[PDB]
Amino acid sequence: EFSMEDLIPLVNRLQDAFSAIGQNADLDLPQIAVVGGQSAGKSSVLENFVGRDFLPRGSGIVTRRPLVLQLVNATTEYAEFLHCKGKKFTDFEEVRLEIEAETDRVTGTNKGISPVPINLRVYSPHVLNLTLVDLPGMTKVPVGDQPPDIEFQIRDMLMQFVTKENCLILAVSPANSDLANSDALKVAKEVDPQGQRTIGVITKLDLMDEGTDARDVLENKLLPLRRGYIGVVNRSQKDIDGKKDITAALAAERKFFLSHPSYRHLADRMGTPYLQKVLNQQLTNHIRDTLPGLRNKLQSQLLSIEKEVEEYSRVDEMLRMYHALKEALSIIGNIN
Amino acid sequence: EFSMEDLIPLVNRLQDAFSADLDLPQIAVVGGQSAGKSSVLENFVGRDFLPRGSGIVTRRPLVLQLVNATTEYAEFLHCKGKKFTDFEEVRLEIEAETDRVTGTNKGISPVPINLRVYSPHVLNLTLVDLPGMTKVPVGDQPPDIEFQIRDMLMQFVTKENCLILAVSPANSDLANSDALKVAKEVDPQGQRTIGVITKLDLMDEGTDARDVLENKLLPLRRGYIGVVNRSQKDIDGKKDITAALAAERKFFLSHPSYRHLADRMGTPYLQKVLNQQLTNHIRDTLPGLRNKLQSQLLSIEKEVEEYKNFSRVDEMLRMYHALKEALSIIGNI
Ligand SMILES: Nc1nc2c(ncn2[C@@H]2O[C@H](COP(=O)(O)OP(=O)(O)O)[C@@H](O)[C@H]2O)c(=O)[nH]1
Ligand SMILES: Nc1nc2c(ncn2[C@@H]2O[C@H](COP(=O)(O)OP(=O)(O)O)[C@@H](O)[C@H]2O)c(=O)[nH]1
Ligand code: ALF
Ligand code: ALF
Ligand SMILES: [Mg+2]
Ligand SMILES: [Mg+2]
Ligand code: NA
Ligand code: NA
């Protein structure tokens, strides 16, 4: 009867301890990271997991730092950032502003990026028990005052997440561009050739040119993926501006698939609700099969933290990682 | 007084004789797959002869020589002696010839298809249609298709007299532009890169490309020109060029973010600018062209000098005469 719930007690502690001191890139915990070109609609897809407006979204470069989003099912609903402990947020608009402010603090407002992640934990009776990673979208040419190698700084940042064995890759591609043009799929095939942990998501289906559709892609025929593709339709910029809510966006999406002559026959396997259901199941299957591997990785990190203790505030930080790992090992050893 | 018309007697003689080493003036399109490149080039003629569509369509370079003339017809260097009057047959030939040399359903070939179109409504210049860049192979395409396509483009855009039409679709952030990335690589100073923004009619409600079109997001010396070409539905319905141009004109005049730029937007404006830029570009580098020709003449002269017996020989002589004639012509301009 294994589920993500069983991992919650250990994931929670480990994330605090490691990400707190900039070592987030050490743990190989189960998570789902979003990859794709700039403005493909990645943050819009992730935001739906919470059901509230809280992630900065928009055309042009908006997400500029990774966001490690820990979702925990709980009776009450509130959010907390690792960078400002003690402060609990109930207003999701204020959560959005803090992500924007924390991003600007480090990356400025002249379009730069930073691989330092913002860690946010959200407790809600409506969410699944998953960790999502929002990431800046891949680009080809620098604009404004971005550095000349911005494309590679962005790729490097994403690679650090997606090369991990327990990271499910959500390869996001916009319907209004040929799939052959997909930066998400190129990246995904490079790190996960067999497609064992890659899921395709086609966004912006409502923006396709008249007389065309993505049926061949959605039926998994154009470029087959082991895990298939799921189509979604999120809010346009006009919608965001006009304050259309998620409940209304979801209804428009359901109607879109049921009434589109190219997709009606696939409607049951399309949409945001379906994507979230499938992602949860896929992550559950992945970790169920890789639990021994996770235990062995934590055993390795523990061996590593021990050696580091003897080499020596920084002591407190290391001890917190040490105890979280010891506890994680005990908890995981009891999971079947 | 100098105009592309002055080069017609020269360019045609040379092209015919040479069958690269010739750096003749031309305009090449670069961009991601299905950015709208072939659709842009087709407007230079207006006879639905270029295969267009979503998915990979253009799969071989097409070197298209346009010549203003009283009669309208076309010739393919590979179909010697046959003059095409039916443009649908022309479109079908491009398709068949593409299948012939690529030898695959979706792969490409860098061997160009040479086509010349005579028409009373065309400018006098050469356009090069090219497959769009991709990232992942589909169907029977080779695993390195991305690099085979980039290599193919490079064959044209590294040339000194090749103007680069960097085509980027408006429905994708400019920062994602394969076109501008390649243009910057082969032409850092932008002396020969002209930006074209297609699919302006497809942008998400609530957004616009004003900063791109005002040359502020990623400035180019030559600027950016926005166009609105026919959709796939329109193509399938055979919408004519006249209707497409009127809808384009209406789009810019009615869009609140672009109306103030209307006099420098659109297909007619793009073609005027392209012609002028190509004319200026070659007018200023004419002595350079002359030397390029002269070096090939002097070279071939020595070899042809000892010719005195008795179709490689015939081909060599034709190049000699063509080069010798071109030299005289250019010398008078
Ligand atoms: N019409 C439409 N617009 C969308 C869709 N998904 C996202 N957008 C818009 O695309 C832009 C980019 O969204 P964002 O989620 O910030 O993408 P990200 O940069 O890749 O995280 C915003 O202006 C969204 O309103 C979609 O399915 N349909
Ligand atoms: N709505 C719209 N569709 C366009 C526009 N330009 C091209 N298209 C469509 O985009 C697709 C690609 O056109 P094509 O010229 O073949 O691009 P190429 O592959 O880059 O040569 C076709 O389905 C065209 O109908 C445009 O400005 N607006
Ligand atoms: F704002 Al982005 F990829 F363009 F998150
Ligand atoms: F058909 Al293309 F670039 F996709 F010419
Ligand atoms: Mg984002
Ligand atoms: Mg084409
Ligand atoms: Na964006
Ligand atoms: Na195409």
Q: Which of A35, A39, A69, A187 to mutate to test the pocket of ligand 1 (most atoms within 8 A of CB)?
A: A39
Residue carrying structure tokens 């050893």: A333
Q: Checking DSSP bridges between strand B62-68 and strand B125-129, what pairing results, if any?
A: antiparallel
Domain residue extents for chain A: 1-336
Cα Dmax for chain B: 74
- Taking Cα atoms as reference points, which of A324, A335, A332, A333 lies closest to residue A302? A324
Rg of chain A on CA atoms, in Å? 20
Contact A124, A50 (CB under 8 A): yes
Pick from B55, B176, B231: CB nearest A209? B231
A210 touches chain B (CB under 8 A): yes
Q: What is the DSSP letter of B27?
A: E
The alpha-carbon gap from B99 to the nearest alpha carbon of chain A, in Å, equals 20
- Containing H/E element for A139? none
Separation of alpha carbons A50 and B207, rounded Å: 26
CA-nearest residue to A185 within chain B is B136
The alpha-carbon gap from B306 to the nearest alpha carbon of chain A, in Å, equals 54
Question: Under 8 Å CB-to-CB from A267, ≥6 apart: which residues?
Answer: A257, A258
Provide the 3-class DSSP secondary structure of residue A173. strand
Could you tell me the CATH superfamily of domain A1-336?
P-loop containing nucleotide triphosphate hydrolases (3.40.50.300)
Q: Which of A209, A212, A213 to mutate to test the pocket of ligand 2 (most atoms within 8 A of CB)?
A: A209
Distance from CA of residue A218 to its chain's centroid?
A: 21
Of how many residues is chain A composed? Answer: 336
CA-nearest residue to A216 within chain B is B55
Q: Which of B34, B64, B149 to mutate to test the pocket of ligand 2 (most atoms within 8 A of CB)?
A: B34
Burial class (CB in 10 A: 0-12, 13-18, 19+), A130: buried
B230 annotated to bind ligand = yes
Residue carrying structure tokens 């809808």: B247
CB pairs under 8 A between A and B: 122
B232 annotated to bind ligand = yes
Q: What is the DSSP letter of A268?
A: G
Experimental method: X-ray
Pick from A141, A142, A236: CB nearest B204? A236
How many CB atoms are closer than 10 A to CB B108?
Answer: 24
- Taking Cα atoms as reference points, which of B136, B175, B129 lies closest to residue B152? B129
Distance from CA of residue A67 to its chain's centroid?
A: 8
Residue carrying structure tokens 């979801």: A250
CA-nearest residue to B54 within chain A is A178
- Taking Cα atoms as reference points, which of A207, A272, A250 lies closest to residue A40? A207
What is the CATH T-level fold of the domain B1-333, as seen in this structure?
Rossmann fold (3.40.50)
Best residue in B204, B212, B220 to probe A by mutation, most A CBs within 10 Å? B204
Separation of alpha carbons A322 and A309, rounded Å: 9
Contact B40, B132 (CB under 8 A): no
- Taking Cα atoms as reference points, which of B120, B99, B12, B106 lies closest to residue B63? B12
A178 touches chain B (CB under 8 A): yes
Burial class (CB in 10 A: 0-12, 13-18, 19+), A314: exposed
How many CB atoms are closer than 10 A to CB A88?
Answer: 12
Q: Note the ligand closest to the C-alpha atom of B42.
A: 2
The alpha-carbon gap from A265 to the nearest alpha carbon of chain B, in Å, equals 22
- B236 half-sphere exposure, CB direction, 13 A CA radius: 9
Q: Using CA positions, which residue lies closest to atom 3 of ligand 3?
A: A137
Contact B193, B166 (CB under 8 A): yes
Residues forming beta bridges with residue A37, ordered by sequence position: A138
Contact B204 A209 (CB under 8 A): no
- Backbone φ and ψ for A138, nearest 5 degrees, come out as -65, 140
The alpha-carbon gap from B326 to the nearest alpha carbon of chain A, in Å, equals 41
